[PDB]
Amino acid sequence: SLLNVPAGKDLPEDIYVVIEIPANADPIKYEIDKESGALFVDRFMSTAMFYPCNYGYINHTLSLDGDPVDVLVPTPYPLQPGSVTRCRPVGVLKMTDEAGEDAKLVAVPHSKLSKEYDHIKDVNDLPELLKAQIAHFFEHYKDLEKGKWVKVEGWENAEAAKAEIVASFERAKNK
Amino acid sequence: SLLNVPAGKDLPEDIYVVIEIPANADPIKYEIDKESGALFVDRFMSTAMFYPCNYGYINHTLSLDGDPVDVLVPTPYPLQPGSVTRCRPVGVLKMTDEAGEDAKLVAVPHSKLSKEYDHIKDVNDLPELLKAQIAHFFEHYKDLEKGKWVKVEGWENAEAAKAEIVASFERAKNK
Amino acid sequence: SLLNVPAGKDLPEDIYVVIEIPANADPIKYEIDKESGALFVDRFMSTAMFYPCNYGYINHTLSLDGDPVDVLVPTPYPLQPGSVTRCRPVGVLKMTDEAGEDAKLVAVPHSKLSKEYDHIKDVNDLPELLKAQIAHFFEHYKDLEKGKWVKVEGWENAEAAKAEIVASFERAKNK
Amino acid sequence: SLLNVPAGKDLPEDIYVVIEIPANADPIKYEIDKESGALFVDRFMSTAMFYPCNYGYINHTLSLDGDPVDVLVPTPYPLQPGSVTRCRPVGVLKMTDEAGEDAKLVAVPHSKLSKEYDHIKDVNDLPELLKAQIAHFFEHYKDLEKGKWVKVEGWENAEAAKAEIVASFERAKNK
Amino acid sequence: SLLNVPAGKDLPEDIYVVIEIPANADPIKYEIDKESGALFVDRFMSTAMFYPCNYGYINHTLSLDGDPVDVLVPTPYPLQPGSVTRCRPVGVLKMTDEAGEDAKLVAVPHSKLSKEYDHIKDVNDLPELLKAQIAHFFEHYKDLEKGKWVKVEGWENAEAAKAEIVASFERAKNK
Amino acid sequence: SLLNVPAGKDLPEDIYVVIEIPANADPIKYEIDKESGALFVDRFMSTAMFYPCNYGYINHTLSLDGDPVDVLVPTPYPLQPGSVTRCRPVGVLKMTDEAGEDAKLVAVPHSKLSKEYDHIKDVNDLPELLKAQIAHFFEHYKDLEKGKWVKVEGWENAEAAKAEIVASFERAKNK
Ligand SMILES: [Cl-]
Ligand SMILES: [Cl-]
Ligand SMILES: [Cl-]
Ligand SMILES: [Cl-]
Ligand SMILES: [Cl-]
Ligand SMILES: [Cl-]
Ligand SMILES: [Cl-]
Ligand SMILES: [Cl-]
Ligand SMILES: [Cl-]
Ligand SMILES: [Cl-]
Ligand SMILES: [Cl-]
Ligand SMILES: [Cl-]
Ligand SMILES: [F-]
Ligand SMILES: [F-]
Ligand SMILES: [F-]
Ligand SMILES: [F-]
Ligand SMILES: [F-]
Ligand SMILES: [F-]
Ligand SMILES: [Mg+2]
Ligand SMILES: [Mg+2]
Ligand SMILES: [Mg+2]
Ligand SMILES: [Mg+2]
Ligand SMILES: [Mg+2]
Ligand SMILES: [Mg+2]
Ligand SMILES: [Mg+2]
Ligand SMILES: [Mg+2]
Ligand SMILES: [Mg+2]
Ligand SMILES: [Mg+2]
Ligand SMILES: [Mg+2]
Ligand SMILES: [Mg+2]
Ligand SMILES: [Mg+2]
Ligand SMILES: [Mg+2]
Ligand SMILES: [Mg+2]
Ligand SMILES: [Mg+2]
Ligand SMILES: [Mg+2]
Ligand SMILES: [Mg+2]
Ligand SMILES: [Mg+2]
Ligand SMILES: [Mg+2]
Ligand SMILES: [Mg+2]
Ligand SMILES: [Mg+2]
Ligand SMILES: [Mg+2]
Ligand SMILES: [Mg+2]
Ligand code: NA
Ligand code: NA
Ligand code: NA
Ligand code: NA
Ligand code: NA
Ligand code: NA
Ligand code: NA
Ligand code: NA
Ligand code: NA
Ligand code: NA
Ligand code: NA
Ligand code: NA
């Protein structure tokens, strides 16, 4: 099952991300169901927005929104929902939503998958346009869903991302 | 596994549908294999037709064609094969095929996924064009497959759909 | 050429819309060039948004942004850029942008193309979700493009849409 | 303009086909407008069917339905609406519809474009499945459009196709 | 799980192939992970090439590259990654790569799925273009990945393919 | 017509490129016909390769292969065949093919369309992977077409690209 995938080969620098939503896809918000491992439709998004990157989570982690910690993974081509990608964290967008605090990690494909992202070492190496698109997306994607809301609080660096990974891996572990 | 998804949160009004074939897709007829939970290609359809809605089944049900009961789910965008959608039954197309009687339920995305279909309470609220397309599809999609055939017998309302769900949930339960 | 297509068979109730951008497409903002009739890339949109409907213009009209008046056309399936669709106006989103006032008409496929939209007679017959998505789109799609901006000013009815069509058809005519 | 493309390099064996509808596409029935050369939406098809091959016409020809003669062109990948393909006729499906008699030619990509279809010399060399799909399509695609109808009358060989081409090229020529 | 799918209904003539990569897809090289059954991104291919056919493996087999034996499956439409197709072997491209010897079987959809490939009995019945495309693909797809390499050694017939299947099914069985 | 588009707003630094083939598309080699302006299928490519970037030409130029000079344009999303993009030359891949010498320019979207490529000033600023993919593509895409061949001769800088543009604009001008 997708429930039995590790958090990573060597957390926090070498992680696996389970993809739920491909980059640039139709506005279907899929989420993996914890007990079955199946991809469920969480909702049909109301705004005419798309995720700027592939979107998923790190297995065996727990955030403060009651879900595994969330990751954006830029790739040259969109990934399949339910697939798993080896990546390296490079930054994090801090934010809270209606279900609790809910950081959005950015992790790039691992060097072994591709050399394309090897030059992205830290958050300042991400394209400004991409970071700005990601922030705008999270600021606005819930604008038409009553009872769903966001506070975006800014970008933090790879060490912050890594600290989040470690802390979420510790959370699910005695939870 | 997709074999461990419930029939629904509160059958028959609140169901889960496992999707096998997206709306408006290529003519590959996928079916979930009961023992592995995998998506198998059942066949390459011979007619140049597509399913008017996403197509799948309710887990832990049994129809008279030896398969779980079949459901059509209209959505704004096609769903992924193998994904699961929470829905609400609104009508049923009665029909029989070569493998035995084989009703085609229509269920719309649950209000929690989207408000888009909340106005569809019963079968008369479905668009006439959509119902007519669905009936035509089932009347003709097997026209070029020898030994596969259909008798479409007309549309019935949400209570009939719900009765079918309950009865199929009872069938698999002592089968 | 696409420059020689009429404004419509019987303006303002029966119009032709030249499509520039399909619904639910990649964020490439195409515009027809007036002198060549070719589809040019105006820009690569910076926000992660898509047009909720097909988007184009009525030929031989002139708005206050120096362009033909702009139209959104809902369809069951996205249209090809450069194609032309016969439609019927049903409402208008009033708004201004950096290039001047710039109304966004909504027109549905003509009955002769499809009966699907015949029940949409006026702006109140459009789905609330669709109208809300359209307004949100225009409110936010320029949020990351410096020097591009929007003031959305609300929805008006089919007669207002029709008055706009007539007035823009008169503008280009002694311009 | 697409109005100025020849009927072919050497009719009837070497023709050009202007494509209006790609194979396996969404059910949007495009038609080139004779006076503008633009692709217009003729209608949104009501049945859940797709064209088994790319579909278009031979320029500077005239059929008995008031339109240029119609051609199906099988290709390995769907063609773009408005593109032009060099082909070789191999057979014809005879049929009439509401607008008058309306043969459906089949022509394969010319050897110069690809060697893939060089083995298809005549109608008996077309796959049986493809011919059967084409006939079924034309038998049924108008089943839900009132006032549109078809009589399919069977397959004829490459010489018959070629005779049709010549005769339609003569028709438009003193018409 | 995809790990519990059989090698086939009646090996070697009747096999199941688990698909990892669809025909004509984006250059994402997916591989099923043996212990989780999940689809992992193995790498982002560096060359601008696509697989000429759907690509996957026979479960419960073991090749000399440490992986299940690899199969190409031509279909009329691309298959979903993670789906399973019943097929019949018709030939094999012999080759070695950096991970060891690594034959590429070709197997066509079983007659029960479609009659389309029933005329392909042996390797000489495959289109020359398709075989040539497959060989060229394997000759060149690793050209830009350092440390990945190929020696293509030519085509062999259905009996050779079948012998490979049997031998790989025996290998994993006491391994 | 696409024949009446300028070479550029201010050649050679500010050019327009007419797109014939989108990036990452199916292997249909379209070419604009000079006398009609229509997109014709030149051929169905035999290798399983795709263009790494959008591909087209500069109007009103003439190369030594008897065609307008050829340009690759990287974009975030593939462009429509027949569309026109404003760009800035940054480098050139020198090469000859069977029809004569045939340089492949690389030009990035103009700053006015997007700021994404503003950091690419010269050929050394292009990603190494992209340049390597482009060279490999041209080295191999004709490998299965008899009588079509290539000699790739290496990368040259933006000034070389610009000199090519100027010289081709002069060639068509007294030709
Ligand atoms: Cl773990
Ligand atoms: Cl930002
Ligand atoms: Cl249950
Ligand atoms: Cl009906
Ligand atoms: Cl007019
Ligand atoms: Cl609104
Ligand atoms: Cl002619
Ligand atoms: Cl037939
Ligand atoms: Cl087995
Ligand atoms: Cl070969
Ligand atoms: Cl010029
Ligand atoms: Cl290079
Ligand atoms: F989450
Ligand atoms: F079933
Ligand atoms: F405009
Ligand atoms: F016609
Ligand atoms: F392998
Ligand atoms: F060229
Ligand atoms: Mg959630
Ligand atoms: Mg999450
Ligand atoms: Mg959240
Ligand atoms: Mg979350
Ligand atoms: Mg079945
Ligand atoms: Mg079923
Ligand atoms: Mg059935
Ligand atoms: Mg059934
Ligand atoms: Mg503009
Ligand atoms: Mg406009
Ligand atoms: Mg504007
Ligand atoms: Mg405007
Ligand atoms: Mg017609
Ligand atoms: Mg016609
Ligand atoms: Mg007709
Ligand atoms: Mg006709
Ligand atoms: Mg491998
Ligand atoms: Mg393998
Ligand atoms: Mg290998
Ligand atoms: Mg292998
Ligand atoms: Mg050429
Ligand atoms: Mg060229
Ligand atoms: Mg060339
Ligand atoms: Mg050239
Ligand atoms: Na998309
Ligand atoms: Na909200
Ligand atoms: Na489709
Ligand atoms: Na049948
Ligand atoms: Na899209
Ligand atoms: Na702005
Ligand atoms: Na399609
Ligand atoms: Na009819
Ligand atoms: Na593809
Ligand atoms: Na290599
Ligand atoms: Na593609
Ligand atoms: Na060659």
Side-chain angles (χ1 to χ4, degrees), chain C residues 12-175:
Chain C
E13 178 54 296
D14 191 353
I15 64 167
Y16 290 125
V17 177
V18 178
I19 305 301
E20 292 170 315
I21 305 167
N24 196 32
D26 291 345
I28 307 159
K29 203 299 178 177
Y30 295 107
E31 294 187 356
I32 292 291
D33 165 43
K34 274 199 157 116
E35 220 22 275
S36 72
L39 200 71
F40 277 60
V41 175
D42 183 71
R43 68 199 182 267
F44 294 99
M45 302 203 13
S46 286
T47 57
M49 308 191 79
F50 61 82
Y51 284 77
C53 304
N54 305 283
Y55 181 79
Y57 69 92
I58 309 172
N59 205 28
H60 301 126
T61 65
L62 182 48
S63 281
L64 302 177
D65 73 339
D67 295 350
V69 61
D70 296 319
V71 190
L72 296 146
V73 181
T75 62
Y77 304 97
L79 298 177
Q80 183 79 340
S83 65
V84 182
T85 299
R86 193 183 183 177
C87 299
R88 172 169 57 82
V90 298
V92 57
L93 178 65
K94 293 288 284 188
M95 48 147 292
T96 300
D97 70 12
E98 80 279 339
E101 129 88 55
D102 200 18
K104 303 288 176 259
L105 300 168
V106 178
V108 300
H110 193 279
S111 54
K112 148 116 133 228
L113 273 56
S114 205
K115 300 138 132 228
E116 173 174 357
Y117 301 90
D118 286 350
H119 69 285
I120 304 187
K121 291 212 221 125
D122 210 340
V123 70
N124 281 343
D125 300 320
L126 290 168
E128 290 319 299
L129 180 54
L130 182 64
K131 287 185 287 185
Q133 288 167 332
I134 290 164
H136 182 268
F137 174 88
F138 284 107
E139 284 162 1
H140 295 289
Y141 79 129
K142 282 174 155 173
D143 282 349
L144 301 178
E145 281 162 66
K146 259 191 193 259
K148 307 275 216 180
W149 56 264
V150 179
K151 175 54 183 229
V152 173
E153 320 149 59
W155 287 96
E156 301 185 357
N157 70 8
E159 281 279 319
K162 287 170 216 201
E164 175 89 63
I165 291 170
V166 166
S168 298
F169 184 77
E170 289 293 331
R171 198 145 342 109
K173 201 220 239 155
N174 194 158
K175 256 76 239 151

